[PDB]
Amino acid sequence: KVFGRCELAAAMKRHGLDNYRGYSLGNWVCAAKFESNFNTQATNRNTDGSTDYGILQINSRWWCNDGRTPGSRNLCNIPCSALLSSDITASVNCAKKIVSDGNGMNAWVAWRNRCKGTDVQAWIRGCRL
Ligand SMILES: [Cl-]
Ligand SMILES: [Cl-]
Ligand SMILES: [Cl-]
Ligand code: NA
């Protein structure tokens, strides 16, 4: 599913991401924009053999099981395919674990390089939330 911007904002808010670990909703929408372009089906292979999955590009080396990342943990205890579903629950709940692990949203490279320090509230402007 390719979410609309405000559609994704509303879903993320409903699932408790607005202000989660102190990160306002626009941070999460901005991260999803640049990680996946709001496409739940996005997958991207990394140099180390892991793959990133879903709207927040969650990595198979630590967070989900894809069966082809040797040495992987599965800290969200989910198949990586669950992170490709139209229903973002699994991605949100796994993202909550990631952002709580110590480095905050710096876990998302696109967030650090394209969202951090910017006017992230712009990403929820115009939405009825
Ligand atoms: Cl915001
Ligand atoms: Cl694996
Ligand atoms: Cl933080
Ligand atoms: Na894994």
From Swiss-Prot:
InterPro entries with a match to the protein in the record: Glyco_hydro_22, Glyco_hydro_22_CS, Glyco_hydro_22_lys, Lysozyme-like_dom_sf
Catalyzed reactions per annotation: Hydrolysis of (1->4)-beta-linkages between N-acetylmuramic acid and N-acetyl-D-glucosamine residues in a peptidoglycan and between N-acetyl-D-glucosamine residues in chitodextrins
Disulfide bond entries: C6-C127, C30-C115, C64-C80, C76-C94
PROSITE patterns: GLYCOSYL_HYDROL_F22_1, GLYCOSYL_HYDROL_F22_2
Domain C-type lysozyme: 1-129
Principal location class: secreted
Protein localization: Secreted
Single GO MF annotation: identical protein binding
GO terms under biological process: cell wall macromolecule catabolic process; defense response to bacterium; defense response to Gram-negative bacterium; defense response to Gram-positive bacterium; killing of cells of another organism
Active site, renumbered: E35, D52
Highest taxon of the lineage: Eukaryota
Keywords: Allergen, Antimicrobial, Bacteriolytic enzyme, Disulfide bond, Glycosidase, Hydrolase, Secreted, Signal
Binding site for substrate: D101
EC number: 3.2.1.17
Something else known: Lysozyme C is capable of both hydrolysis and transglycosylation; it also shows a slight esterase activity. It acts rapidly on both peptide-substituted and unsubstituted peptidoglycan, and slowly on chitin oligosaccharides.
Function: Lysozymes have primarily a bacteriolytic function; those in tissues and body fluids are associated with the monocyte-macrophage system and enhance the activity of immunoagents. Has bacteriolytic activity against M.luteus.
Family classification: Belongs to the glycosyl hydrolase 22 family.
Record note on quaternary structure: Monomer.
Name recorded for this polypeptide: Lysozyme C
Organism, scientific name: Gallus gallus
